[PDB]
Amino acid sequence: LVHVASVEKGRSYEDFQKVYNAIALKLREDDEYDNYIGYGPVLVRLAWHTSGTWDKHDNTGGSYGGTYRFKKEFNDPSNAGLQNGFKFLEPIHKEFPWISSGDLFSLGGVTAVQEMQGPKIPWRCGRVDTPEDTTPDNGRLPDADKDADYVRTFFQRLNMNDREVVALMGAHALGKTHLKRSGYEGPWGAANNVFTNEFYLNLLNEDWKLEKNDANNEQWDSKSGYMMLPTDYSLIQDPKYLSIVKEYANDQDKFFKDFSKAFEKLLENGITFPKDAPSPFIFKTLEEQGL
Numbered sequence: 001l002v003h004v005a006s007v008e009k010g011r012s013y014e015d016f017q018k019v020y021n022a023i024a025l026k027l028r029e030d031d032e033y034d035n036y037i038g039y040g041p042v043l044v045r046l047a048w049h050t051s052g053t054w055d056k057h058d059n060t061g062g063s064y065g066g067t068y069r070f071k072k073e074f075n076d077p078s079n080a081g082l083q084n085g086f087k088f089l090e091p092i093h094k095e096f097p098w099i100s101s102g103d104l105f106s107l108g109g110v111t112a113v114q115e116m117q118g119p120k121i122p123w124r125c126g127r128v129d130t131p132e133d134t135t136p137d138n139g140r141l142p143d144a145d146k147d148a149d150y151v152r153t154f155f156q157r158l159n160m161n162d163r164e165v166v167a168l169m170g171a172h173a174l175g176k177t178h179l180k181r182s183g184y185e186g187p188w189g190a191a192n193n194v195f196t197n198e199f200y201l202n203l204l205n206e207d208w209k210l211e212k213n214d215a216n217n218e219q220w221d222s223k224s225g226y227m228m229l230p231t232d233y234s235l236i237q238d239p240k241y242l243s244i245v246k247e248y249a250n251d252q253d254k255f256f257k258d259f260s261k262a263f264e265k266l267l268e269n270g271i272t273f274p275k276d277a278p279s280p281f282i283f284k285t286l287e288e289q290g291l
């Protein structure tokens with residue numbers, strides 16, 4: 001299966017900037033969600049989970065088809081809690097019904113990273129909604145109880161290398177684990193709705209203890225009130241991942257640039273962009289627009 005990007009009829013940069021702005025303004029307005037974390041982190045995770053079902057071997061799953069709108073995928077246990085991001089985007093989709101579901105879900109992630117002061121993420125339009133029978137089965141999203149070998153093997157299915165994996169994982173600065181959603185509890189740091197390299201600094205600098213949470217699952221905890229999943233912690237157990245963690249801990253700009261590339265790639269996996277497609281768009285933030 002080849003998924004060819006097809007621009008929403010007649011639409012151009014300014015149309016999508018309006019969509020970006022509506023998501024950004026809602027993000028500002030609906031500030032109370034998740035004990036005042038706001039929707040930014042769950043939107044980044046929604047973009048990732050809608051993309052991360054991709055299999056490079058047969059081009060199944062991925063962001064193109066916007067299949068999270070179908071029950072099989074919205075009810076994936078791995079997706080618990082993402083319904084809050086979907087609900088957030090519903091009025092956006094009502095206002096701008098011309099946008100495809102995959103374009104909305106990926107653009108939600110981009111908007112969220114940028115509004116939270118993260119890097120600019122170039123984004124391309126043209127995802128097309130595909131039918132319910134194209135929904136990928138549950139179980140393509142990764143488990144958190146596993147080791148570095150698991151992580152490395154897992155992400156080969158998404159055509160990601162060590163650098164790309166370590167860079168992507170830095171999104172775990174954002175948000176938190178919720179015991180009832182995933183069996184893990186706690187934030188990864190202090191700045192959990194601002195996009196920084198804190199995930200890496202915390203890995204290296206905090207004094208981590210291996211504990212059991214109230215779900216009887218092991219996680220790494222610090223006295224500052226932070227946590228890491230076992231798959232997070234695996235990035236400092238494995239000597240290849242560790243070198244990269246150290247690099248991002250010591251160079252904010254490099255983390256930003258590599259994250260931006262890896263996240264755009266994640267979001268575009270599976271999609272064939274024709275040769276005369278528009279160039280990727282770089283959206284202005286609300287701050288840059290004086291809005």
Ligand code: HEM
Pocket residue numbers: 041042044045048081142143144145151168169171172174175176177178179181182183184229231263
């Ligand atoms: C080994 C790969 C990964 C595993 C096992 C994993 C696992 C998890 C788990 C268990 C949670 C907690 C969910 C909850 O209880 O609410 C979570 C949260 C999150 N993950 Fe991942 N994750 C991975 C990779 C990524 C990547 C690649 C991204 C994006 C680039 C990402 C973004 C997020 C975000 C933003 C949250 C916070 C969501 C919220 O606060 O509602 N994760 N992850």
